């Protein structure tokens, strides 16, 4: 089973933190990557487990991970996913569906 990544739509105000949860369980090792997928120019691997403003933390149940943007900016808006990489016989990536982050302007 692929990771799930939630919430599917997270809206926060610029300056706030933004946290997605990637849930993935796999009996026998993995790397768990957090990718930005859009906008097309901005696609990038953000952060990883195990390894600035993007943090990935494994929760104590071992199956949930928090992927957090610290102090979200307007141009953090876009879509994101989590992908798990396995090497055990024998190597593949399983990605979640995307989730969207909307970062709302602080209009004075």
Distance CA 35, CA 89 (A): 24
Cα–Cα nearest to 96, from 9, 19, 35: 35
Distance CA 107, CA 54 (A): 25
Distance CA 76, CA 99 (A): 13
Q: Are 89 and 37 in contact (CB under 8 A)?
A: no
Residues in CB range of 102: below 8 A, 6 or more apart: 9, 10, 11, 12, 77
**Two tokens at 88?**
């055990």
Experimental method: X-ray
**Two tokens at 56?**
């990935």
Burial of 94 (0-12, 13-18, 19+ CB in 10 A): middle
Bridge-based pairing of strands 44-49 and 18-23 is unpaired
Domain 1-108 class, CATH top level: mainly beta
Angle at 31 between CA 21 and CA 6, to 5 degrees: 15
Number of neighbours of residue 99 by Cβ within 10 angstroms: 21
**Two tokens at 32?**
């768990």
Resolution in A: 2.1
Domain extent listing, the chain: 1-108
């Amino acid at each position: 089973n692929p990771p799930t990544f939630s919430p599917a739509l997270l809206v926060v105000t610029e300056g706030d933190n933004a946290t997605f949860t990637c849930s993935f369980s796999n009996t026998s090792s993995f790397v768990l990557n957090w990718y930005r997928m859009s906008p097309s120019n901005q696609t990038d691997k953000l952060a990883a487990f195990p390894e600035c403003r993007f943090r990935v933390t494994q929760l104590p149940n071992g199956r949930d991970f928090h992927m957090s943007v610290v102090r979200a900016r307007r141009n953090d808006s876009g879509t994101y996913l989590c992908g798990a990489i396995s090497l055990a016989p024998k190597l593949q990536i399983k990605e979640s569906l995307r989730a969207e982050l909307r970062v709302t302007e602080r209009r004075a």
